Protein backbone atom coordinates (compact mmCIF):
# COMPACT_ATOMS: atom_id res chain seq x y z
CA UNK A 1 0.00 0.00 0.00
CA UNK A 2 1.32 3.43 -1.00
CA UNK A 3 0.31 6.50 1.02
CA UNK A 4 0.93 10.11 0.02
CA UNK A 5 -0.11 13.38 1.64
CA UNK A 6 -0.39 17.07 0.76
CA UNK A 7 -2.44 20.18 1.55
CA UNK A 8 -4.44 22.29 -0.92
CA UNK A 9 -7.26 24.82 -0.94
CA UNK A 10 -10.67 23.51 0.08
CA UNK A 11 -12.36 24.43 -3.20
CA UNK A 12 -10.50 21.80 -5.25
CA UNK A 13 -11.09 18.83 -2.92
CA UNK A 14 -13.56 17.39 -5.43
CA UNK A 15 -10.87 17.80 -8.11
CA UNK A 16 -9.02 14.76 -6.68
CA UNK A 17 -10.74 12.06 -8.76
CA UNK A 18 -10.03 9.98 -11.89
CA UNK A 19 -10.68 11.83 -15.13
CA UNK A 20 -10.80 15.25 -13.46
CA UNK A 21 -9.17 18.24 -15.14
CA UNK A 22 -8.17 21.75 -14.18
CA UNK A 23 -5.30 23.87 -12.91
CA UNK A 24 -4.09 21.49 -10.18
CA UNK A 25 -5.38 18.14 -11.49
CA UNK A 26 -3.45 18.54 -14.76
CA UNK A 27 -0.25 20.37 -13.74
CA UNK A 28 0.53 19.15 -10.19
CA UNK A 29 -0.96 15.74 -9.35
CA UNK A 30 -3.06 13.43 -11.55
CA UNK A 31 -4.86 10.19 -10.63
CA UNK A 32 -5.09 7.25 -13.05
CA UNK A 33 -8.41 6.70 -14.81
CA UNK A 34 -8.56 3.13 -13.43
CA UNK A 35 -7.57 4.24 -9.93
CA UNK A 36 -8.58 2.05 -6.99
CA UNK A 37 -8.26 3.13 -3.38
CA UNK A 38 -9.75 5.39 -0.72
CA UNK A 39 -9.65 9.16 -0.12
CA UNK A 40 -9.57 10.90 3.27
CA UNK A 41 -9.71 14.66 3.83
CA UNK A 42 -10.59 17.04 6.66
CA UNK A 43 -10.22 20.70 7.55
CA UNK A 44 -6.87 22.23 8.51
CA UNK A 45 -7.88 25.83 9.23
CA UNK A 46 -6.54 25.51 12.80
CA UNK A 47 -3.00 24.18 12.23
CA UNK A 48 -2.10 25.83 8.91
CA UNK A 49 -3.26 29.47 9.04
CA UNK B 1 -18.44 13.08 -25.45
CA UNK B 2 -18.36 16.85 -25.99
CA UNK B 3 -20.68 17.44 -23.00
CA UNK B 4 -19.71 14.85 -20.36
CA UNK B 5 -16.40 13.74 -18.89
CA UNK B 6 -15.30 10.08 -19.23
CA UNK B 7 -16.28 8.74 -15.77
CA UNK B 8 -20.03 8.61 -16.51
CA UNK B 9 -19.97 9.20 -20.27
CA UNK B 10 -18.54 5.67 -20.32
CA UNK B 11 -21.69 4.46 -18.55
CA UNK B 12 -24.00 6.53 -20.77
CA UNK B 13 -22.67 5.20 -24.08
CA UNK B 14 -22.95 1.56 -22.94
CA UNK B 15 -26.71 1.79 -23.50
CA UNK B 16 -26.05 2.63 -27.16
CA UNK B 17 -23.78 -0.39 -27.69
CA UNK B 18 -26.30 -2.69 -26.01
CA UNK B 19 -29.18 -1.32 -28.08
CA UNK B 20 -27.27 -1.50 -31.36
CA UNK B 21 -26.17 -5.08 -30.69
CA UNK B 22 -29.75 -6.05 -29.86
CA UNK B 23 -31.00 -4.38 -33.05
CA UNK B 24 -28.31 -6.05 -35.16
CA UNK B 25 -29.12 -9.51 -33.78
CA UNK B 26 -32.67 -9.44 -35.17
CA UNK B 27 -31.46 -8.77 -38.73
CA UNK B 28 -29.39 -11.95 -38.94
CA UNK B 29 -32.09 -13.84 -37.03
CA UNK B 30 -34.64 -13.01 -39.75
CA UNK B 31 -32.13 -13.61 -42.55
CA UNK B 32 -31.49 -17.12 -41.21
CA UNK B 33 -35.18 -17.99 -41.59
CA UNK B 34 -35.47 -16.36 -45.02
CA UNK B 35 -32.45 -18.37 -46.19
CA UNK B 36 -34.19 -21.65 -45.29
CA UNK B 37 -37.39 -20.47 -46.96
CA UNK B 38 -35.46 -19.72 -50.16
CA UNK B 39 -33.58 -23.04 -49.93
CA UNK B 40 -36.84 -25.01 -49.86
CA UNK B 41 -37.99 -23.34 -53.08
CA UNK B 42 -34.55 -23.87 -54.65
CA UNK B 43 -34.78 -27.60 -53.91
CA UNK B 44 -38.29 -27.69 -55.38
CA UNK B 45 -37.05 -25.94 -58.53
CA UNK B 46 -34.16 -28.39 -58.82
CA UNK B 47 -36.56 -31.33 -58.55
CA UNK B 48 -38.86 -29.82 -61.18
CA UNK B 49 -35.94 -29.21 -63.55
For chain A, breaks with the C atom over 2.5 A from the next N come after none
Chain B interface disruption, residue of A15, A19, A21, most B CBs within 10 A: A19
Cβ contact (<8 Å) for B7 and A17? yes
Q: What is the DSSP letter of A17?
A: S
Method by which this entry was solved: cryo-EM
Residue A20 half-sphere exposure toward CB, CA atoms < 13 A: 17
Chain B residues within an 8 Å CB radius of A17: 7
Q: Which residue of B has its CA nearest to A17?
A: B7
Task: Find out whether A24 and A8 touch, Cβ atoms under 8 Å.
Answer: yes
Chain B residues within an 8 Å CB radius of A18: 7
**Distance between CA A31 and CA A19 in Å, rounded?**
8
**Distance between CA B2 and CA A44 in Å, rounded?**
37
Residue A4 half-sphere exposure toward CB, CA atoms < 13 A: 6
**Distance between CA A19 and CA A35 in Å, rounded?**
10
Resolution in A: 3.5
**Composition of chain B by helix, strand, coil, percent to 5:** 90, 0, 10
**Distance between CA B44 and CA B49 in Å, rounded?**
9
Q: What is the DSSP letter of A12?
A: G
Amino acid sequence: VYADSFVIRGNEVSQIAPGQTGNIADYNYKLPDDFTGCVIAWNSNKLDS
Amino acid sequence: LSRLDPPEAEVQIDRLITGRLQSLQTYVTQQLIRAAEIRASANLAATKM
